[PDB]
Structures are given as C-alpha cells and as structure tokens.
Design a protein around this ligand. Sequence first.
Ligand SMILES: [Zn+2]
Ligand SMILES: [Zn+2]
Lengths: 131, 131
Amino acid sequence: MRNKPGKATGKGKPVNNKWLNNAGKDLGSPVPDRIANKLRDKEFKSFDDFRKKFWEEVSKDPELSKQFSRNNNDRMKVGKAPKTRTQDVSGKRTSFELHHEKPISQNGGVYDMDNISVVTPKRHIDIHRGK
Amino acid sequence: MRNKPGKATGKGKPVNNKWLNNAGKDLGSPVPDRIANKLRDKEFKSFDDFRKKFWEEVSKDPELSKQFSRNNNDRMKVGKAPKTRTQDVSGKRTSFELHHEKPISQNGGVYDMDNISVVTPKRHIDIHRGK
Ligand SMILES: [Zn+2]
Ligand SMILES: [Zn+2]
C-alpha cells in the first residue's frame, strides 16, 4: 500500500514557532494545519512522493521555513527532509522522518495527515522498538 | 552490534511437541533450553551467523526436527529458517524470524538467548508496529 498512489486527507494541527521541538518524544510533531491545507485533496504516486511534496510545502510556508537554517531550507526546497542534530541521527538516517501512527500494515491511512507525524530517526526507531 | 562477534548466553526454556505453536502471538516461542545447552558460551561472528547455526542446531535435535516437514528440515539442515503457513508471511518474509525482546539499540543482548524468541513475519511486523 505504501507505494501505491492515493489522495491526501486530514486537518493537521496549528503549530507555534517551535514546531519540531517535540520531534524526539512521544509521537513527535504533527502535520501543520497550514501544510495540510496545501496538500489536502491532492493525488500522490507513493508515500515517498507525498514525503517530497510535504517538505517542499514546508519550505514555501513563511512561518514554518523561518524555524530552519538556510541549509535545511535549501534541502526542503527540493523535497529533502531537514537534517537533525547529530544526537538524533542513526547511521544513514540523518534527517527528520514521517511516522504513521496507525501502521499501514494495520489499515492505517497512507496519506492521512492526521495519522502522520514528524519524528527524529532516534525516536522513530524507538517507536518501532528497534527498527 | 548485531554485526559484531559475541558469545551466546542464556538458558532458554523447556518446550513440548508444539514448539512454534504460539509463534504468531505475543513474543512467540522461546529458544529451546535444549538448543541453548548446545550454543551457550559459543562465539559467533554476527547475529546472522548465530541465526544460521541456531536453525542448524534445530535440525540436529530429534525432538525438535520431528515437529517440521521434510522440506522444512531440509532448510534448517543448511541454516535456513523454516517456512511459515501462508497466512503468516509478509511479502518476501516467508520464514520464521528471531526477535530481540529488548532491542540491541537499547543495549539488549545480541546473543542473549533469553532475549531472543521465534516469531512469524506477520507477528514480528506487528511487534515492531508496522515494520
Ligand atoms: Zn513509523
Ligand atoms: Zn524484533
């Protein structure tokens, strides 16, 4: 399912000036309701496609982009996720990741933004108990 | 690291004639005490090496091997994991898997047989919340 096309849905949530502040704990940071407004009802080829588009919208949002360094904004401008602090990386996984709260393998929505959150590699791995 | 050498420790647990009975639920089936008796204190190059020798030991145990079909014994004889019933597979993961209760990423013993169990792919994916 993850690699099959779908339409984005979901409301997301309003975020403040420290959006990814809690990306290293619990379920991490929600999809901003501003980003969801831009992606909602849009068709994607695969989750990876959504992923790419998700970060591009982040670089286009005046309030969201300002919370990142130039280097991370440049990355997001081309669909690449922002790099985390060294403390939060794990091997080749060095940038913020998107997690599905309810696993796609368990009928979880692939493009349901209310089922998607932003987490650090380190936290994502702990969420999946080591993977 | 699961890719670095180490010595197997742990006592394992007694089993009956239905060893992999609960491989599809909870933490699955434990490492047979009989298998741990043979592997304890031995050195392995990597967890993969342990995995192969673990299945080899199973094929060598009369009580355990007799619980599998000829085709599955053939696989373990050469260090390969036995195939599961179709309902328990997931994509290319079609054979029983070893799961570390406490993850290596969390200082869990890589070769601690009391931290290792046998689970179907479907169940293992569920334990890792989606992967
Ligand atoms: Zn996840
Ligand atoms: Zn596992």
